[PDB]
Symmetry: C3
Subunit: 479 residues, 3 copies
């Protein structure tokens, strides 16, 4: 009779966006992983000290609040609000210092201490009874007040250093500590990776009179000392300098950058594990991309995008006579038939395997391209700590928008390449079948062939594995 080849007919699932048109496909999936309901924290420590500690207490190493100086830092951390009351000095913080201490208290790296070098360079630190509990600060009060000096040091990592002043309230104490007249404004400057400065004066003179008002009172009500702080940034190789006068204070620790913990905001659930956790839930295992609005995450995490996109999973539906599809039911994607169902139709696994492998290879190449673009766009030697510190209070990252646009443009190319590869596979298969059939077999040109003899179902399935031979079918002539 006649024989035809084509694709198995399956119900249409959806539509994908090719470069030149929209293609109807029998199966599609989503490239990026989706956030889940809870946080999977099986087999991991949770640090919760929000009942006794504060943001500044960890920095200043108050008793019982020593997260930055721990040994095995937990991945999840939580503590009191920024305006908590400590048991030592009253404190005031610059906006930059606030934005940087929201982050630096929970870095998971190793913090370098240089208080000793200061001790041998400038003698013993200042001593006061109001800071008995607190144990991490150097107070520069030389005998020859004020005696300005410049402290030079080659940094050991890339981090943040907190510097400023520690001054009392009464004029007598201020004069006795600084040795300067009350009507004098004096500066403390920091020159590392960037230049920063802060100004001070007497208690009843600007701008310290606002430092008293805006200060955060301590737990004990009989302390007159206020510590005013500001932040400066260093570099691993470069040398940083601090301009120190009498009364100046500095927290002797370089809070090295790196990955920093997250503060849970949703339900914490045990008995389940994951690999990429966020502040609002974890993510499924082995995701190529992540639906997230930031680069802050813990564990092994792929690049983040803002919205999902659809990629192909089956094949194009090029059918509704013979239109290209096969009415029979077969176990595969491509097949050959003689308009008979049940025994006269067979499927070939080679084309299906080639199509699946092509889909997988195209997806892998696209993922590699996206990863390379992400690395170029953020930098190979990046760090979440500095990436969020430099952002500040801004919650919109335009680089994420650029990355999302790049992924959106890449998905269309993926679909186009997959469809073109499928078309090439089909053309090669039909040309091979035509060559195998021989030159005495008429070709319809639409994928069907019309033999000069009768071709039963054995005639059909013989072609399936390519063992068909012309000799056994020479008998009889028909058109």
């Amino acid at each position: 009779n006649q024989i035809c080849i084509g694709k198995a007919i399956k119900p249409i699932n959806g539509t994908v966006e090719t470069v030149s048109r929209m293609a109807k496909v029998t199966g599609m999936k989503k490239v990026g992983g989706e956030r889940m309901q809870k946080i999977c924290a099986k087999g991991e420590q949770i640090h919760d000290s929000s009942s006794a500690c504060g943001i500044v207490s960890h920095h200043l190493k108050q008793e019982g609040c020593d997260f930055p100086f721990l040994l095995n830092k937990p991945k999840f951390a939580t503590t009191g609000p920024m305006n908590t009351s400590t048991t030592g000095f009253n404190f005031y913080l610059t906006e930059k210092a606030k934005s940087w201490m929201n982050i630096t208290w929970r870095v998971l790296g190793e913090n370098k201490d240089f208080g000793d070098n200061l001790v041998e360079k400038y003698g013993e630190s200042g001593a006061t009874s109001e800071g008995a509990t607190l144990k991490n600060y150097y107070w520069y009060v030389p005998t020859a007040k004020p005696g300005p000096v410049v402290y030079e040091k080659l940094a050991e990592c890339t981090g943040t250093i907190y510097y400023g002043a520690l001054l009392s309230d009464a004029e007598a104490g201020y004069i006795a500590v600084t040795g300067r007249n009350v009507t004098e404004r004096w500066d403390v400057r920091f020159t590392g990776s960037s230049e920063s400065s802060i100004s001070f004066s007497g208690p009843k003179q600007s701008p310290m009179e606002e430092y008293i008002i805006k200060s955060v009172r301590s737990s004990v009500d009989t302390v007159r000392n206020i510590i005013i702080l500001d932040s400066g940034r260093v570099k691993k190789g470069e040398t940083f300098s601090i301009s120190l006068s009498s009364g100046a204070v500095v927290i002797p620790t370089i809070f090295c950058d790196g990955d920093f913990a997250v503060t849970p905001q949703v339900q914490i659930d045990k008995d389940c594990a994951s690999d990429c956790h966020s502040a609002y839930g974890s993510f499924p295992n082995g995701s190529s991309f992540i639906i997230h609005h930031s680069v802050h995450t813990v564990g092994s995490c792929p690049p983040s995008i803002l919205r999902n996109f659809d990629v192909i999973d089956g094949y194009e539906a090029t059918w509704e006579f013979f239109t290209g599809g096969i009415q029979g039911a077969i176990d595969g994607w491509y097949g050959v038939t003689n308009h008979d169902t049940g025994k006269g139709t067979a499927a070939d696994q080679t084309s299906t395997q080639k199509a699946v492998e092509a889909i997988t290879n195209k997806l892998n190449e696209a993922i590699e391209n996206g990863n390379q673009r992400y690395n170029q766009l953020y930098g190979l030697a990046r760090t979440q700590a500095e990436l969020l510190g430099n952002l500040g209070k801004e919650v919109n990252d335009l680089r994420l928008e650029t990355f999302t646009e790049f992924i959106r443009l890449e998905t269309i190319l993926v679909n186009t390449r997959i469809i073109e590869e499928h078309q090439a596979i089909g053309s090669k298969k039909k040309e091979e079948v035509k060559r195998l059939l021989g030159p005495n077999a008429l070709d319809l040109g639409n994928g069907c062939f019309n033999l000069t003899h009768t071709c039963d179902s054995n005639c059909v399935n013989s072609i399936s594995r390519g063992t068909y031979t012309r000799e056994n079918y020479i008998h009889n002539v028909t058109l």
Copy 2:
């Protein structure tokens, strides 16, 4: 004889840019509208007070200059330059104050007042005879100078607040108002969405000695008071704080964000209305995009681009013996003929209607994609006032360049999609013709068919609406 189908031959208009090649088409149009010569301002109010007022006068609510406190603010406003002299105090403005006063005096929104709360918190304002004309300012002069305080308030909108000081020139007045020593430098700080500060000292002392020199003298020459102003930004939800001392002044009005009026620079023409207006001319009704160098506009306006692009409007000219075209004249785009002109050639409205629908749909999809990209790139909850304020003195916007590049890329995809859709329509039509014609008719493969019988002009017309029947044409045999 024989029958053929194809497209009507029309003169070639030009070339458009497809992804893979350049396509010669019989018609194109431009995606974006063009600025017109004049401004169409029919049925809209125009404000012009450049002969009596100035930028600062509107802020300070001078008698006869109260644009920000109006009820129905006109969309076109004009006033005197920045350095115009008011009838009240001599004034000095920081560069930020100038850059923000260029905008905030002509906002079309509603401004919020908080002078009352200041009155109850810190008593009555200071009194001076030199500011009788002015009516919008609060002068903080407590009984016990200096008496520093901090003013906290939760804002109601997103805008700018102008603060600073108001001090005399003589040393006696400065000492009487401020209560500070002349050899003292004090500060006024603003802490809202961002940190700002301003410094003052004695009249014969830096930095005020330059404040007198750079001040703008008033109309009356017997005033010794200078008001020094600076700008700060607030946020709708968060709380802003100002550090006040004796002598500090603040303008109690939050100039809320929103659209702001344009200052016409071309001829204003009545008797004609429009929808989108610019400072250099109006724009046509219902434009998909605007050829503009900035995002400042009034009325309903689409996204702005920097240069025009060509989109397809006809169809590709795939012809110069039959090449694909039809030499005869028909009312449409596609047609069928038997190499006869006038009565043997017939046209079908279905294919032309489908092509027009395809063009419209592709253009609509492109416009939607461009709008979505514009929204992503600027932000859904944006505001022209803050967008132009943050630019400052910069006249080049890189985001407009990015959007223009995106639109230039999108137009090529639009042309490719339209051409592919036209090709698909043509292929489907010729397949339908071949199946309707029958299996006894030879197919040339180039769109022509060669029948076994003679096919006159009535035969050609029969196929046109599909009522062709093979019975009445059985007679005679020809090849």
Copy 3:
């Protein structure tokens, strides 16, 4: 017998990336030129004064160190480090001043002077015996100290101006020069294209006690004068103002922007010349692009990218029976044969010339598009001096990354268009030859033609130039 046409078979060289697939081509090249080992500086003079001069000495016009005031400024310059010791005053520079002096000492433009205007406005400059060697500065010491003034001037070019103070160490000298009390802080402010300021106070008072410590001591150890400098920026059309008090100093020279010299870091070799020189080597003549990590170069230099990409140079290898190629060896790309080698195979130069011209035209269009995009992305009126000054200490330019991505995307389109044009040329050639042979010749559809008669080597050879005629080959009939 039969005749076939196709492409000459050549070994596969490489693979290029098309929009929808990966293409195998017989020849490819690289879009951008590559840096070489040395610097080809034949016929160019080199300035080297690293043993006597310093960065600041060139600005201050020390004897024997006058690069900024030359007439024929060399393209290659080298001098001592920033912290060298001059023979006059001790000097201190701000971070901005350091970053801008790293550049402005070697600009190749013409620098504008305005010292005469200052002299005729405010009298003669201050006189000190410690700066006899130095010759480029204006010291402001009015008779009636302090006597603050504001200096207004309309700038002549776009450049940088260095301003600050020149103050002694002893209290008596400071009081005599400035005329102020020691416990006073006074500011010098600059308002041009931007705002800048610097502060000064007594010697035993902040922030000058740190200026003394951080200063660079001069060669002579008996000097007490320290010059503290800072940088401000001006615009060609606008007016800049400086707030001058007694004791302030300004370097009266606008260092106009433009191309600035490069400091060699590799071996300098004469006896060889090039067109574009970088700081680490020259580049090949007539390069379309440059593999460079910055926009700093001397001479005529094309736009810079970060990595090379591959573009097609031959043609696609669409073959492994006849598959499309020609087994014979011919001098060209396209040819016609009758399965005979040596005399039955001939090639046509028309198709080869058309293909080469298409490749050249596509590359030229791509280069034009890239240059235009570079112009939009940096600006038509750009300047290397300001483009590198605004960067500061940042070594990564995101704009270069964006341009590299744009070039990478453009290369794919170039390959696609070239392949499409080659396919169109082949289709036109085969259609033309099929038309030439006539309607009595059988068409295989794969590019091979099968004649009713025998077609010897002379027959196939005559077809190449199109002089084939039917009359002399009618003899004999064969299928």
